[PDB]
Amino acid sequence: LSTASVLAFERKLDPSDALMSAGAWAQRDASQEWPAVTVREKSVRGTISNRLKTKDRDPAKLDASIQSPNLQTVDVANLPSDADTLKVRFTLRVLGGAGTPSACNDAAYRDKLLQTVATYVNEQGFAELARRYAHNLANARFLWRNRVGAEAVEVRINHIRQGEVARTWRFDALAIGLRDFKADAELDALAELIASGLSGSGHVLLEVVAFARIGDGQEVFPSQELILDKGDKKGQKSKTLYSVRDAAAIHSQKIGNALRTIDTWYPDEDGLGPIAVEPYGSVTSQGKAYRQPKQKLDFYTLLDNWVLRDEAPAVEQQHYVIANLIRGGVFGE
Amino acid sequence: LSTASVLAFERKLDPSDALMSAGAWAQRDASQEWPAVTVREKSVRGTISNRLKTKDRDPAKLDASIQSPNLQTVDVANLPSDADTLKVRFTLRVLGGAGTPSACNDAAYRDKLLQTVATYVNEQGFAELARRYAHNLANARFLWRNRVGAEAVEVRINHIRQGEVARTWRFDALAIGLRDFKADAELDALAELIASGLSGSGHVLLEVVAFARIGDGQEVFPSQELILDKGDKKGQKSKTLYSVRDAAAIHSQKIGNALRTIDTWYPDEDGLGPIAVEPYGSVTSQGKAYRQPKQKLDFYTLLDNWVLRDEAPAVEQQHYVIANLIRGGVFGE
Amino acid sequence: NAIHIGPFSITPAARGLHYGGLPHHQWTLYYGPREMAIKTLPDSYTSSEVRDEFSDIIAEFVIDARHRYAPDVLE
Amino acid sequence: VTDPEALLLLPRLSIQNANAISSPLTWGFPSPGAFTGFVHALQRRVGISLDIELDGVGIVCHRFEAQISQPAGKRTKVFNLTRNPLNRDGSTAAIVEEGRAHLEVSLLLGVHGDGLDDHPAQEIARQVQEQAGAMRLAGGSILPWCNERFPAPNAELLMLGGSDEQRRKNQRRLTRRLLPGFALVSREALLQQHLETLRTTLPEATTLDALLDLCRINFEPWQVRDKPGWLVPIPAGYNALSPLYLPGEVRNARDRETPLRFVENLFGLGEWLSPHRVAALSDLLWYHHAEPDKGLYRWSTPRFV
Amino acid sequence: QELRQFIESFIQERLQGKLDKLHPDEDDKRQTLLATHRREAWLADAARRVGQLQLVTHTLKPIHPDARGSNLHSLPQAPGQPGLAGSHELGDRLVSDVVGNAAALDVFKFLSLQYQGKNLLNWLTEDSAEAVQALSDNAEQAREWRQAFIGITAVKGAPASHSLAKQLYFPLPGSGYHLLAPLFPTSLVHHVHALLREARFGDAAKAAREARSRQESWPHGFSEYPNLAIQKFGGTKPQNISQLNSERYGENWLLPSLPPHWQRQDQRAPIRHSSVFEHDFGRSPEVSRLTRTLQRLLAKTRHNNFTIRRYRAQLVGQICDEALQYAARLRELEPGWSATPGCQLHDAEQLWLDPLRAQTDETFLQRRLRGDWPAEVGNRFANWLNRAVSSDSQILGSPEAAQWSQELSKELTMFKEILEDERD
DNA sequence: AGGTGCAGCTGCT
DNA sequence: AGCAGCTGCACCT
């Protein structure tokens, strides 16, 4: 028995693009007609602040570079001067049926994998994973830089059963930290709903709205696009922000990456905090791979030891493997 | 007698390119001015997630590969943020005269083929194949990934005889599963209609519209294009969705492949579900060919045993070869 | 490995990226201290291809500078 | 060669997945031989049973939509393909490139037989429409009726009937239904004229049809040498590479009851024009004729200017 | 004689390729056995592969790689009908195509190398002493070697087609049908591909392209081909289909055979006051290019004044038809006729370009529009044409400008008749 | 996201 | 008593 040649997993926990709108705090219950945060342009005169090559550290060349500065156009998004609260809204569907791949070659490999995940579900439910997902919804981690230095963050989560709301959760997202996973009754009820969605025993659709009290006219941070070339035929536009229908918006993969920031079992440390679940669980902001393949704690070696050779790892690493299965991806040769 | 050197069956069950649109649930009766779902672009930045070679498990090399960003441009298609229902509409014409090939070099072989399929219609009608095609139109199998995890799917089929609607069918596509084949009076009436269209007793025209209740602003999945790479050149857009006049669409052959998923008589198993009918019946998702030529259950040897050798196979294998006749093809040496 | 075309200079960005799976680099075209353009060109581009990517902008600069500083005409 | 007694108008034919390549040199609109074969199969299917003959096609191409893409670093174009099913060993398939397209075209069909004699015009038009709503045109399916409820019925128009001024008024009111699209004609005379005035430099013929339909940019005596119309390459027809062959003597024929030959494509120049630029609406009818003593098997549209 | 010595050198080159694949276990034993057998009987080994070769113009393998059929080498007769371009016209430009296995293509490359230098390309068959003395074989072996090249030059195929080929029906005049099996012309596309890659890149083409930027003119011809389509032949291995498929890298270039407007863009007719007031002019991109091409021709002298006036009349007739087609596409494109905020005279001409009265449109205003035909809007179009055609005392004082205005008035009268035929 | 052939091969009789 | 197929291998740029 060997691993399959092609083997692919569709994602559970599908979010949408989060849209931004603006309003005043304590009108946030009437925040259905709040106007969108629009993306504008402004001019930026760039100074000289890079490290020099020290073949270019001659003072005459430096002053000649300072005398002629370069200029860009830059997309920017601010709150209005009369509104102090950013509202960010998206929808998230929890699907279930996490072990089944969407593509496979070997029948014996997918049957061994299916009974492996069946034994995992029978040992413990999705309660740890859904507890951590509900925590990452409770604290507003999906506000990436908009949460930083906010005065008050409040998350409203609506389980939507038919076209109307079935249940409502209200969270103070600054009390629920970004560091540890506590216990709370409403948080455990949300975790039970997410675990019921992940187990295939229901169809879970939630609407997540987050209100951050930042200040009047302050800068908000939508998702940022990719610029390949830049010339004078444009405005020397050097920064593009993502937008859905003239609304500053966040990419769906950004919200998804902030949802699955649950991995506290990586071997290097635990005082740093959780990271996102990746094969060779890596942080682009730190340029580093936790769970290196030289240690036996990346996703691929753990999966191959669990399925092929029946070496079941510790329950923390089993949580990590099933989290990587819910995350989805292309796993094969 | 021998096989003709050319053999060419024109396809029946011609579908159209299914166009997508969006709106709210319980407005689906007035869903004629529903706006089209459009294809946007966005940027993705990923990490290293695939399997590394055993020579490339070096941790310094892994960190040095991580510290170079991985950026793609991706075509995406979403629902609007105030619509939760995807509407997929296509037209399907049934022609009839399922026996006659478009080309046959041997005259006596085509006469033996014509009386063979004539005797097949005389033995029983198309009602097995017609009931299975009406099942695949009843459950929304043509919603390929859009059906997965949907809240409520609902199919409306309008038979149009003249310029106006002759008859209407209304189905809850989630009650009708994808595994078994039931019997229902409306479903059997549609089966009679498509059987009479297949028998050459008319030219049936159908308009099929499927409403899936996914969620507000969620992602839909149209067809993807085939772009062969410009290898020694710049990087390309790494996903391209199909669109007909700025409306996200599913390919015609994708709907056709979803329609003829009727074959529950392949020898390997019977609980894995129906597959699409083709000679050496092979699914691309499993990557493995059922109905191998080393067993005598593929299309070519069954056709040669029924026509040339006059060994009539079992009634489900006659159903299989009749479905391969309706499917069409270019057969010969 | 900068490229010099007269007064123009095309320099790469000292750390590439991966666009579409392939390794690329950002090349900046300067006219002295004034930055004229930026492109993102793949690796395994020879320097002739890097020159012929910016040749059009260089030619439009020559056209505008030739028309702008044209001498006077007496009749 | 034969002036039609009447014209039938296939009003707005939408076609999905039609063949785009249609030639080893062109890739755009399909060849006119496809439309001539369409009306010959239509005459075989419903034309014979009505004491009607059909002779030619006029085509106007209301809209075009090719399934192509431009590969992001080049000025040329590639075709979008389909995923064929796997081989019998389940490995993969062999990629053969085909070019699909979407078309909106109208057809002008000439009639000589007992048109208004045996049957009225409305029933003839309706059953020819019903017959054409069950076949396929150029490798791609005739897309059936959708929420276009207006453009359904045809107009069987008698050519020489009525007064000559009334003839011009009814052909103008039929041209009023052919406004958005641009009709297609053959331009062999313009090809030979430019071939003769080019032969003052060198005697080559395919280099003419190269130089006729590109953007020639001539130096300053910066200009662009231009033709007054929309001159395109077309597959002009077939010229035989072989003598005649009996129905049995070649293996793997389509039928053992019809003679066979090996052929090559002759290429010529066509032209897209506005339909108001032609005064006689029977000038646009593409006839295909055989000269079987040699290989010259032609589609053209004679009697046009 | 000396040609034979050259052939031996070619054999040595083949050995070098084998040498790169060096194995210390047993590679020397295979290498010595290969090199001695090659130096002994390279011609005898090559003739067995060269039997599989076929020298051909027209191939069936581009139609489908799975297909197998007869591929014929001929240059067809000159056609009688005028206005024709084909592979038959350029006979001296022709290049021979090879069909076979890739190992046979190695021997084909060896034979093509043997054809160069001396007259041994036509002298592989027509020579005995000079052929055998250089080949170093027996006279019977030399005759057998000459017979192999004579057979490889010949077709050696039974007449047949395949099921994957086309084999279409052509109808006869008042008779039955004929089967026509079209073959892919391979030498013809190779010649057209040589001409296209010469026009696209050379020192002539690149020099003319740099001269367009420099704007300093030397006498030259500069060609430019827009939106060719690339078709890849068979798989990633191009040598399987043909020999020239490997030289053209398995791709052939297709010229655009498209209709004029094949990229539909939605036009915003809708309700602005200045939007309708400026859309009364309605300058489009292709109309703007036609207007620049027409305006350049204006100052032309009387020596080309006849052809220049004919070109100006053709440009005016093209611009009138483009305006009629744009009005027709704008009328069909918009679903309703929307009221505009503060749109006077944009609504005034838009009533002439109007569709039928809608639910928002009044029956009284619709009846007023249906009662009067908008010929005065055609007069406004004449005002647009006077905007397009610059006139002054150089044309008004001369006789040619009055004739140009008369031709423009005749074109405007035809356009006004076509417009007034609809309304009223 | 190759066609080809042919050497060898299986075989059970 | 062979036959036919069949799989597999190799070529080659």
Numbering used by the authors:
A (entry chain Q), B (entry chain R): 6 to 338
C (entry chain V): 2 to 76
D (entry chain L): 3 to 223, 239 to 322
E (entry chain X): 11 to 434
Verbatim from the authors:
CRISPR-Cas systems are prokaryotic adaptive immune systems and phages use anti-CRISPR proteins (Acrs) to counteract these systems. In the type I-F system, after pre-crRNA is transcribed, Cas6f processes the pre-crRNA into small crRNAs, binds it, and further assembles with one Cas8f, one Cas5f, and six Cas7f proteins to generate the crRNA-guided surveillance complex (Csy complex). AcrIF24 targets the Cas7f subunits by engaging up to five Cas7f subunits (Cas7.2f-7.6 f), sterically blocks access to the crRNA guide by the complementary target DNA, and induces non-sequence-specific DNA binding to the Csy complex. AcrIF24 forms a homodimer and further induces dimerization of the Csy complex.
The overall structure of the Csy-AcrIF24-dsDNASP complex aligns well with that of Csy-AcrIF24 with an RMSD of 0.458 Å with 5313 aligned Cα atoms. The reconstruction of the Csy-AcrIF24-dsDNASP complex reveals three discontinuous stretches of density that are not accounted for Csy or AcrIF24: two helical densities each bound near the hook domain of Cas8f, and one vague stretch of density with a cylindrical shape bound above the AcrIF24CTD. The helical densities near the hook domain of each Cas8f allowed us to model two short segments of dsDNA containing the PAM (G-C/G-C) sequence. The dsDNA duplex is clearly separated at A1(TS)-T1(NTS) position, but no density is observed for the following sequence of the protospacer. For the cylindrical density above the AcrIF24CTD, however, it is difficult for us to determine the orientation of this segment of dsDNA. We speculate that the cylindrical density might be contributed by dsDNA molecules bound from opposite orientations. In the structure of Csy-AcrIF24-dsDNASP, K247 and N250 of the Cas8f subunit are involved in dsDNASP binding, as revealed in the Csy-dsDNA structure. The density map showed that the cylindrical density corresponding to dsDNA segment is also near the HTH motif of AcrIF24, especially R196 and K197.
